[PDB]
Design an enzyme around this catalytic site. Structure first.
Site, PDB file in Angstrom:
ATOM      1  N   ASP A  25       0.840  -1.122  -0.056  1.00  0.00           N
ATOM      2  CA  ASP A  25      -0.093  -0.155   0.109  1.00  0.00           C
ATOM      3  C   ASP A  25       0.728   1.297  -0.114  1.00  0.00           C
ATOM      4  O   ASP A  25       1.323   1.420   1.012  1.00  0.00           O
ATOM      5  CB  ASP A  25      -0.860  -0.017   1.153  1.00  0.00           C
ATOM      6  CG  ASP A  25      -2.021   1.179   1.081  1.00  0.00           C
ATOM      7  OD1 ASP A  25      -1.794   1.894   0.171  1.00  0.00           O
ATOM      8  OD2 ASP A  25      -2.811   1.171   2.044  1.00  0.00           O
ATOM      9  N   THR A  26       1.151   1.866  -1.296  1.00  0.00           N
ATOM     10  CA  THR A  26       1.764   3.263  -1.363  1.00  0.00           C
ATOM     11  C   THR A  26       1.084   4.164  -0.724  1.00  0.00           C
ATOM     12  O   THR A  26       1.731   5.273  -0.163  1.00  0.00           O
ATOM     13  CB  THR A  26       2.021   3.369  -2.771  1.00  0.00           C
ATOM     14  OG1 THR A  26       0.853   3.558  -3.511  1.00  0.00           O
ATOM     15  CG2 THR A  26       2.913   2.615  -3.343  1.00  0.00           C
ATOM     16  N   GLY A  27      -0.368   4.150  -0.292  1.00  0.00           N
ATOM     17  CA  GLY A  27      -1.007   5.213   0.428  1.00  0.00           C
ATOM     18  C   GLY A  27      -0.805   5.151   1.848  1.00  0.00           C
ATOM     19  O   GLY A  27      -1.505   6.045   2.528  1.00  0.00           O
TER      20      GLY A  27
END
Ligand code: 017
Lengths: 99, 99
Positions: A25-27
């Site tokens: 998850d880059t967020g």
């Protein structure tokens, strides 16, 4: 490897001698895992997202292996609906976004 | 481009003729943007994140440009903590995770 985003980017991780499925998850600033009984000391924390905040337990210097890539850092534990690998560990395995 | 994850992967987007900053979020199925005026019909929908569920306005077939890459897809508008670009649009711009 290269992971496309047609489906959720779920991969197998190893933490505390246990295998789990977790989202790359880059967020997510920091890794947060579904409730689990990790030993050692921790510090309370709250993280916010869509819907509001949840209370989590912050563990430090936890070793996680992500697709055979070892990483060590902060791992939050709390009532998350999904195991989430955040940027704090994604950087350690050399993960990049590419388009 | 190749984007490392030492910082939040924030990029400039253009939607409804307006520039905005948004987070490339591989952990989001959908794209959720902060409150704004958009043209065209919309349907009320519910979306859930780490902290629960929020009410959003669903806009379909909306043009949105992400780092100079064009996409046309669904955009949810509501009380999200931050503008997030989800997989429904990340796939359109050819985005992948690599490590
Ligand atoms: C909203 C972001 C800025 C932050 N979130 C990461 C994000 O990727 C979550 C991660 C996520 C994924 C599934 C369930 C809960 C949270 N995805 C999300 O909210 O997406 C929603 C829109 O598309 C839908 O698809 C998933 C939920 C919806 S977060 O889960 O709340 C979060 C916040 C802080 C940390 N340290 C770790 C995670």
């Amino acid at each position: 490897p290269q992971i496309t985003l047609w489906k959720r980017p779920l991969v197998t991780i190893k933490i505390g001698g246990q295998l789990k499925e977790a989202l790359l998850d880059t967020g997510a600033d920091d890794t947060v895992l579904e409730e689990m009984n990790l030993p050692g000391r921790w510090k309370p924390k709250m993280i916010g997202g869509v819907g509001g905040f949840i209370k989590v337990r912050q563990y430090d210097q936890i070793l996680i292996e992500i697709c055979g890539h070892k990483a060590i850092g902060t791992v939050l534990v709390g009532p998350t609906p999904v195991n989430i690998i955040g940027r704090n560990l994604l950087t350690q395995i050399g993960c990049t976004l590419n388009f």
